[PDB]
Amino acid sequence: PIPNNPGAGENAFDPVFVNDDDGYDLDSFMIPAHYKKYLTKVLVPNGVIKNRIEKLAYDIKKVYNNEEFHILCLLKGSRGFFTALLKHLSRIHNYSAVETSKPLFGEHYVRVKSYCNDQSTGTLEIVSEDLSCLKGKHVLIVEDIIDTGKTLVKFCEYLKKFEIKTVAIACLFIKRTPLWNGFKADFVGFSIPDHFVVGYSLDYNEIFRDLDHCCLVNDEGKKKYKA
Amino acid sequence: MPIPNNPGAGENAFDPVFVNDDDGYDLDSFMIPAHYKKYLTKVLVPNGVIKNRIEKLAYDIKKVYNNEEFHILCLLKGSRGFFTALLKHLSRIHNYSAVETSKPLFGEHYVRVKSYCNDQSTGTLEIVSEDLSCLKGKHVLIVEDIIDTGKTLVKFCEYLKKFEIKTVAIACLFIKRTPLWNGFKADFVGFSIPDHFVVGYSLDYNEIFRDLDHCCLVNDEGKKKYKA
Amino acid sequence: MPIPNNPGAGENAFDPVFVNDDDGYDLDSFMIPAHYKKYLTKVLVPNGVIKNRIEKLAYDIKKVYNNEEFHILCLLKGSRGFFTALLKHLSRIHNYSAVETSKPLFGEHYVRVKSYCNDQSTGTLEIVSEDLSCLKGKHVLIVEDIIDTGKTLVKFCEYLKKFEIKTVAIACLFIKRTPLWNGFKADFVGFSIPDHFVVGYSLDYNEIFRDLDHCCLVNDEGKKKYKA
Amino acid sequence: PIPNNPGAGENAFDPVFVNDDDGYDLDSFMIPAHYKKYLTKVLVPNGVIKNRIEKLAYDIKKVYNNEEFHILCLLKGSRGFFTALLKHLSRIHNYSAVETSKPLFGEHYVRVKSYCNDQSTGTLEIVSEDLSCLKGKHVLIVEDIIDTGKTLVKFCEYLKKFEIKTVAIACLFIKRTPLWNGFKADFVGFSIPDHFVVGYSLDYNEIFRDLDHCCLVNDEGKKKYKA
Ligand SMILES: O=c1[nH]cnc2c(CN[C@H](CO)CCP(=O)(O)O)c[nH]c12
Ligand SMILES: O=c1[nH]cnc2c(CN[C@H](CO)CCP(=O)(O)O)c[nH]c12
Ligand SMILES: O=c1[nH]cnc2c(CN[C@H](CO)CCP(=O)(O)O)c[nH]c12
Ligand SMILES: O=c1[nH]cnc2c(CN[C@H](CO)CCP(=O)(O)O)c[nH]c12
Numbered sequence: 001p002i003p004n005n006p007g008a009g010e011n012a013f014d015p016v017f018v019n020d021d022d023g024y025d026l027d028s029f030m031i032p033a034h035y036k037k038y039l040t041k042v043l044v045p046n047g048v049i050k051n052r053i054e055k056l057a058y059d060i061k062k063v064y065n066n067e068e069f070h071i072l073c074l075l076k077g078s079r080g081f082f083t084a085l086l087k088h089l090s091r092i093h094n095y096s097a098v099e100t101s102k103p104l105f106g107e108h109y110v111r112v113k114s115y116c117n118d119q120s121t122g123t124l125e126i127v128s129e130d131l132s133c134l135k136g137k138h139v140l141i142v143e144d145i146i147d148t149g150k151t152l153v154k155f156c157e158y159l160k161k162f163e164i165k166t167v168a169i170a171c172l173f174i175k176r177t178p179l180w181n182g183f184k185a186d187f188v189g190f191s192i193p194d195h196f197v198v199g200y201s202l203d204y205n206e207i208f209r210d211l212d213h214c215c216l217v218n219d220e221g222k223k224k225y226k227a
Numbered sequence: 228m229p230i231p232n233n234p235g236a237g238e239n240a241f242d243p244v245f246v247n248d249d250d251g252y253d254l255d256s257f258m259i260p261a262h263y264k265k266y267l268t269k270v271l272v273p274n275g276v277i278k279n280r281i282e283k284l285a286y287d288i289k290k291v292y293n294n295e296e297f298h299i300l301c302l303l304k305g306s307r308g309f310f311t312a313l314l315k316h317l318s319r320i321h322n323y324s325a326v327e328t329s330k331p332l333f334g335e336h337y338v339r340v341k342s343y344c345n346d347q348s349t350g351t352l353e354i355v356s357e358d359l360s361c362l363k364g365k366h367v368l369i370v371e372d373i374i375d376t377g378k379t380l381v382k383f384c385e386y387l388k389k390f391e392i393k394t395v396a397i398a399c400l401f402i403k404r405t406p407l408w409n410g411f412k413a414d415f416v417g418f419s420i421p422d423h424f425v426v427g428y429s430l431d432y433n434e435i436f437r438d439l440d441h442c443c444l445v446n447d448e449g450k451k452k453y454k455a
Numbered sequence: 456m457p458i459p460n461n462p463g464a465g466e467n468a469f470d471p472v473f474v475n476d477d478d479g480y481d482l483d484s485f486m487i488p489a490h491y492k493k494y495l496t497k498v499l500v501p502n503g504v505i506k507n508r509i510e511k512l513a514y515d516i517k518k519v520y521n522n523e524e525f526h527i528l529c530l531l532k533g534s535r536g537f538f539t540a541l542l543k544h545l546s547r548i549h550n551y552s553a554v555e556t557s558k559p560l561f562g563e564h565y566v567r568v569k570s571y572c573n574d575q576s577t578g579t580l581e582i583v584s585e586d587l588s589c590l591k592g593k594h595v596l597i598v599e600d601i602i603d604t605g606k607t608l609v610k611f612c613e614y615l616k617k618f619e620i621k622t623v624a625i626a627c628l629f630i631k632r633t634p635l636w637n638g639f640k641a642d643f644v645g646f647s648i649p650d651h652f653v654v655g656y657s658l659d660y661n662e663i664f665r666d667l668d669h670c671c672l673v674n675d676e677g678k679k680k681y682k683a
Numbered sequence: 684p685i686p687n688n689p690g691a692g693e694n695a696f697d698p699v700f701v702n703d704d705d706g707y708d709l710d711s712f713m714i715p716a717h718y719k720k721y722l723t724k725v726l727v728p729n730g731v732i733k734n735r736i737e738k739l740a741y742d743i744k745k746v747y748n749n750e751e752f753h754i755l756c757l758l759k760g761s762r763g764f765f766t767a768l769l770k771h772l773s774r775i776h777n778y779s780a781v782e783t784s785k786p787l788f789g790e791h792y793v794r795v796k797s798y799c800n801d802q803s804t805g806t807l808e809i810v811s812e813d814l815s816c817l818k819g820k821h822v823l824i825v826e827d828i829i830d831t832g833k834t835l836v837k838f839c840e841y842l843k844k845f846e847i848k849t850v851a852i853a854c855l856f857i858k859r860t861p862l863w864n865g866f867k868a869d870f871v872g873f874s875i876p877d878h879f880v881v882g883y884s885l886d887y888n889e890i891f892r893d894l895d896h897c898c899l900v901n902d903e904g905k906k907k908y909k910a
């Protein structure tokens with residue numbers, strides 16, 4: 001059953017649970033030398049993220065089977081997630097494809113913006129191609145992280161206007177924060193503790209998007225790169 | 228060594244890999260999605276060679292920019308794959324040689340640009356509107372998948388200029404030897420390719436084939452099948 | 456569809472990718488280790504294309520063996536890279552389509568074999584002795600990096616036969632169009648290449664160049680520099 | 684300083700510590716469907732292993748700098764480790780190389796065998812090319828795992844005969860078992876709990892070498908594939 005109750009996560013499998021004290025020393029992995037003073041520890045290594053995304057793609061493929069759906073990348077932060085997910089989905093679909101098979105997905109990009117420093121401004125700006133191209137489509141939203149859940153409640157509310165057939169959510173990280181509004185995704189990678197994470201395309205003020213691993217920015221990093 | 232700032236002149240550009248008119252590989256030489264075979268004539272550039280060439284391209288870029296902050300601008304949707312592999316190699320190269328005193332090399336931007344229907348330019352370019360004044364006084368590197376007619380870049384560079392950017396240089400994965408070409412050159416260029424419409428590595432025919440790993444030629448049956 | 460069992464005849468083998476006499480790329484098209492440039496003339500087959508072709512080769516192998524247990528035999532040292540990429544793609548392909556009732560596809564074996572000094576065969580083959588009776592009554596797939604003179608395989612297949620194996624088939628990454636060739640054919644073959652001594656992708660000149668990612672031609676200066 | 688006191692690990696950095704209760708559900712990652720009944724959980728995902736090996740290669744490169752050394756792959760189980768380590772070492776060395784630079788390493792293969800089912804037989808068989816080629820060389824031994832430490836004490840004892848200049852050890856896993864003889868490596872990936880692991884080239888009776896992740900074989904798997 002293709003999901004279609006955004007925020008409920010009706011039949012979602014549990015994420016990898018990342019505990020409050022989980023993670024690794026900066027010296028356990030490769031870290032850009034200059035980034036090292038601004039990071040407290042590695043939370044989730046690049047490699048686990050890729051391994052986990054692979055399974056998500058499989059989970060997704062198993063739900064949609066062969067139904068055409070349309071993947072929306074919520075830019076800029078979900079870019080890493082989205083490229084990884086696409087890679088894996090294509091390989092899984094195309095490895096099992098026969099001569100009579102069909103293409104599986106279309107791809108679309110929406111820039112979504114709300115954060116200043118480490119907090120939501122509680123407002124939301126969006127820029128995309130005209131979303132009327134989604135009318136009557138199965139749509140899969142790909143979001144790097146769910147934090148307050150404001151981005152998605154607000155974004156999914158906007159999507160209701162355009163007569164989309166189904167809306168489902170894939171999320172890489174979900175943060176256990178008391179600021180969360182209850183928005184659950186339908187496919188979820190990791191549940192993480194309440195700290196601001198950078199890397200794997202996630203930023204603090206346009207910095208760290210290039211960091212391979214998901215890490216916790218320390219206070220000095222937050223101060224140095226404050227808006 | 229200087230940062231390019233003559234968009235379209237490619238003043239000091241290295242030669243791309245030249246792909247001859249007869250170059251290519253049979254579909255059965257490589258992995259090809261089963262349903263796609265009947266719509267392709269051949270593999271023009273394998274995924275792996277594309278990736279190895281993006282790697283060198285990123286090294287060229289780093290040899291020009293050095294440690295100078297620049298802003299990388301992705302022309303969606305077709306440049307995604309190119310842009311992705313480029314970020315990956317640039318970061319590794321920049322971050323491998325980085326020292327504790329170093330700083331990040333680039334910012335990343337996305338503009339969606341559209342002009343094709345089937346295998347031809349409509350001659351009009353749709354630019355999805357975003358305020359680009361964050362780029363005022365910045366070095367910008369445009370990342371484009373392909374130069375064909377050159378219309379996309381001629382028009383987009385006019386647009387960009389109005390934002391009072393410091394410099395504009397162009398990274399292009401493919402450049403097509405078509406008579407339609409208006410003469411727009413890139414400053415870093417992956418391959419020079421024969422005049423055939425290509426799909427794969429994020430390049431589509433009517434939203435189809437983007438997921439195809441290799442750069443291949445769509446055949447006429449596929450062009451008719453997927454006509455808009 | 457049947458398991459090959461005529462070592463050297465390549466009875467039903469698919470055609471390899473043909474690399475023409477003039478095929479290749481300039482060293483500056485790809486990443487090349489700085490100290491290696493002066494010893495190479497050109498890139499013959501980029502790393503990425505090698506990898507894409509091993510992928511298809513593994514698919515061919517799986518289309519022949521299906522779910523039948525077989526034993527993969529790595530001819531060290533030069534076949535390591537080839538063997539590695541082959542294991543990777545075979546497992547993914549086998550394990551992606553696997554069901555809960557499935558079983559593993561293959562075992563993996565290693566024999567070290569040696570016969571070259573500089574760029575020529577000594578005409579005598581050193582086989583590092585191991586008891587291979589674990590292979591009695593088994594399908595064995597030999598993985599060899601290159602067929603040149605064909606001496607390695609002719610001799611090694613004689614050796615292997617004494618162990619009373621069920622079948623012997625050959626996977627070869629490269630096969631060289633040299634007049635020295637004794638006619639030994641493989642059953643799965645990656646590329647047919649011109650008659651030049653090649654290095655990279657685990658293939659050496661006197662233990663040098665194995666780490667080089669691309670298959671390139673060593674020049675005469677490098678052959679003289681590293682002469683034994 | 685190139686290490687040269689095999690078993691002491693004189694100046695070794697601490698490994699990633701993998702706790703007794705650490706790991707992931709089989710359903711968190713891709714697992715060959717048929718292997719799933721024979722595995723209790725994932726211990727260390729493929730991706731963390733690769734990320735960790737990358738840093739080891741860096742650690743190694745930093746010690747040897749530009750001195751020629753010779754890498755010995757202890758077959759069959761250390762194959763995955765060895766190929767990963769080589770990949771990363773070459774890229775790190777060749778990325779920083781200049782025109783006047785030199786090749787960094789030679790490579791050699793030694794088959795070492797001692798286990799039956801999940802235990803050492805307390806004997807050791809070895810097959811390699813003539814190790815006299817190591818005379819006067821810096822040698823780096825690459826071993827997938829240290830368990831009883833019998834393989835390496837015995838192997839390093841054999842190497843003393845051949846006038847090797849230096850012997851250093853790189854190890855991917857070290858198991859916290861009371862059966863351990865005290866042999867420490869000089870470069871170490873992970874400290875792991877006391878269970879028999881499979882995957883990433885590590886087997887139980889030639890099975891599981893192809894499993895991407897490092898996992899704990901369950902009792903049913905041990906029984907099914909008993910010698
Ligand atoms: O821990 C973090 N790190 C980096 N970026 C973010 C963001 C910003 N980006 C998120 C959408 O891409 C906001 C999700 P919302 O509206 O539910 O808080 C939130 N949390 C973090
Ligand atoms: O051969 C092709 N294959 C697939 N897509 C395209 C496109 C569509 N996209 C190009 C910008 O990304 C148009 C470039 P222009 O304006 O210079 O002709 C052009 N040629 C090809
Ligand atoms: O062009 C080359 N480059 C590098 N190494 C080799 C070798 C060495 N190794 C080959 C077996 O792996 C010899 C194959 P044979 O006995 O059929 O000539 C042969 N040709 C080349
Ligand atoms: O947990 C495990 N899993 C798989 N294989 C092994 C082996 C077998 N292989 C090791 C050398 O490659 C033995 C190391 P030693 O002599 O110190 O016990 C030991 N432990 C394990």
Ligand SMILES: [Mg+2]
Pocket residue numbers: 077115202203204205
């Ligand atoms: Mg952000």
Ligand SMILES: [Mg+2]
Pocket residue numbers: 305343430431432433
């Ligand atoms: Mg297009």
Ligand SMILES: [Mg+2]
Pocket residue numbers: 533571658659660661
């Ligand atoms: Mg050789």
Ligand SMILES: [Mg+2]
Pocket residue numbers: 760798885886887888
């Ligand atoms: Mg074993």
